[model samples]
Target: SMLPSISPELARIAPGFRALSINVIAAPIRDAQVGEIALKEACQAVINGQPAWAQAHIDAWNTVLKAFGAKPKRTPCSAEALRKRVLKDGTMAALDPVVDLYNAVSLRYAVPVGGENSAAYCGSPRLVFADGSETFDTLKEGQPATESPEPGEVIWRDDRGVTCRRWNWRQGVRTRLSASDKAMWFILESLPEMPVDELYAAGNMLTDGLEKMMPGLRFESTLIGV
Candidate 1:
């Protein structure tokens, strides 16, 4: 269920299935070069639909996760703010290496994967539809709640507050990935069904790409077909 919001465009176009959010044990990455390369590969795969090489990308991410002995977090959520922001921002901010790498893969694959410091997060993590009543910390602190995703927003919520960053566009600086912090994170890959292998392959690509970037990163992946 992850983030509860979606851009009006995505909602208008792909209303059958909404974004599903999850958690992955993530750790901060130190090398910027690794992040750059991973981004390039992810972009190529998405722009070209190179399903064969998707696993390579996922492996790169796994490498990074393993280096810190962190595992991937898989919670049920989606990113509505992310969807809206990308519509305007074009691309998300390249926070630290790990977060940047995750964003790159997400944009490249047209899926959602990214999260804050789960270790510091508390309460029962759950996925639910946004009632348009739940004010995010960003909004509560003064930032306006992003325009409601076309009709509704899906979200990943922690006991403390909205855990998934911007409806779907950006993660908060509070729990964002960093170069010094050692924490767990969530990673995800999804599909609309029809081609069962597409999702399996997507998951592989995500894990493989991450593994290469952070040698020895641990990962957990799931497939949701509709």
Candidate 2:
């Protein structure tokens, strides 16, 4: 099956933009492994890093936001938000083995990494600008809520509603990664400042962690828009 595609608009907004699509075939494991420890260490390291290091990532997101006419604080990108969270709390959320692995990679690399249940997708996912008509099922104040993307907002969607909003700000509940899921897909997004090689390194890190946790796990990856 084909992976997601970047729209011309998004490409124009962030030149040299590319996404690493990783297709994974592995059963979920519940026990903590070395990967989890490595993830926590990486997060702490970023939290303790120099302020300029954190500002570099924030500036990268702000550059993307400026292209789309949005403010960095108001519509912060996923990577920027992740760094801010770690800087504030000195910890990252642990969802599941698969999700945690990617989140760790994202935090370590200072880039946005998205995880989705492959079976939950109607077809291949597409990264495109929304017209404010797509459905987005998410939460608000710990309660179930539904919303739509704003016009010209970047989003990742399939035949179903928005799989991820604002290119990774929030993921829809329909295709969240879970322990029961046998297969998963991950998207590693990079902008101009973050080269494609960094994305490849992030993908390799995640796949390596998966194989270490579950031997013989199968995974494939490709860089799109390169």
Candidate 3:
């Protein structure tokens, strides 16, 4: 299990914040078979459901953003971004088997879900406010660039540098999960409006879906910030 620390400063920002961590080990595939039937179903369900069903989830994320002094719209959480994608196009862009599964589950539950390549990590991951010194790599106009986070911005860091920036807004490219990664780490996040059990359910959904998609997969999960 990869144990990550949630700093008190971050906890104070979002009092009831909770996270679910899930780890999976499986054979990597370059051209992995990805089935979107379940993904389409989940997206359609969101479309058919009440429009306000996701409002609470969005509001919860906004609360977290407000606590961190970030503009929700400017730095929208992953779940909100996914919701917008589905609402705009009725489906998400297929990335890979692991990414597709988590994206589908995130949309289905209306929560932010992030996955990373475990093998790429250097040490224990820590959730804390940034100090403006951590390195953040991203693409700008199709060109690679390195940036630094604003001091006090919530971030996930490892021994090397920032793994995820702005809590769950943008993920660094260094540790991003790819089709060739055999081991992966996933995080499911929720606020007070969304209970921890629901986050666990989302994790279970991902594991179950992945196991069914790739048989003999090994996975373990645990809840954090209860």
Candidate 4:
């Protein structure tokens, strides 16, 4: 079972952190068009400007990164990164249906939503304080590579290595979701800026959108955080 966990040490550091996990037992997709509509709408909204609540989440993430001595401006949170891409190009790359769906939800909600292939995980996930010893599988110059996290950085890891680093800033490539992936997991990392209500609302948006993509797919969601 890929049940998620949050370390007490991590909870103590970011007391306001919350993760809304949506486990997709069958995330089967129809096609790329499954998410194009939502992606288009999200891009259109970002063209003029972002949501009013967007900055709140951005600033909140910067604060968290600074506390951990990580640089936020250089590599902002995932949601912000997606928003920038949409804003700059007026649209986003149509990746896998599952990935694009979460990107749209993240843009609309201004919250970081991450997805992973359930089969790629070595074991259950745990959110913890990295000791600079945990490995993170990623690509370097378009080639597969591995690296370790900074000491004291917050991360989500399995028995294999870091799945995501600096909270939700970057997701490692090892467990990335793919177009044909059926069983999957998604996480919406929420801070006080987004609040609990909005967090669950975002999760619902994901479920609803995903349902439209693959009719009658199975899913389960739970809250994990302070």
Judged by TM-score, which candidate is best? Answer: 4
User: If ranked by lDDT, best first, what sequence of candidates would result?
Assistant: 4, 3, 2, 1
True-structure RMSD, every candidate: 11.3, 2.2, 2.1, 1.5
Worst 10 residues of 1 by lDDT: 72-81
Give TM-scores for every candidate, taking all chains together and pairing residue i with residue i: 0.55, 0.90, 0.92, 0.94
Prediction-by-prediction clash tally: 80, 0, 0, 0
Scored by Cα lDDT, where does model 3 land?
0.80
Location of the lowest summed lDDT over 10 successive residues in candidate 3: 27-36
On a 0 to 100 scale, what is the lDDT of residue 46 in model 2? 82
**CA error at residue 176 for candidate 3, angstroms:** 1.0
Candidate 1: Cα lDDT at 16: 38
Q: Give Cα-based local distance difference scores for all models.
A: 0.46, 0.77, 0.80, 0.84
Give candidate 2's root-mean-square deviation (CA, Å).
2.2
TM-score for candidate 1: 0.55
Considering only N, C-alpha and C atoms within 3 Å, which residue pairs clash in candidate 3?
Answer: none
Q: After superposition, how far is residue 201 of candidate 1 from its true place, in Å?
A: 2.6
lDDT of 3 by residue, 8-41 (tens): 7666678777888888887534234543656776
lDDT (Cα, tens digit) per residue for candidate 4, span 1-226: 4699988876556777888888887745654585778887878877757677788888888888888878888878898898888777777888767788889889988889898998999889988889999989888899999999999988889998899988888899989998578688998998888867888888998888888788778888888877
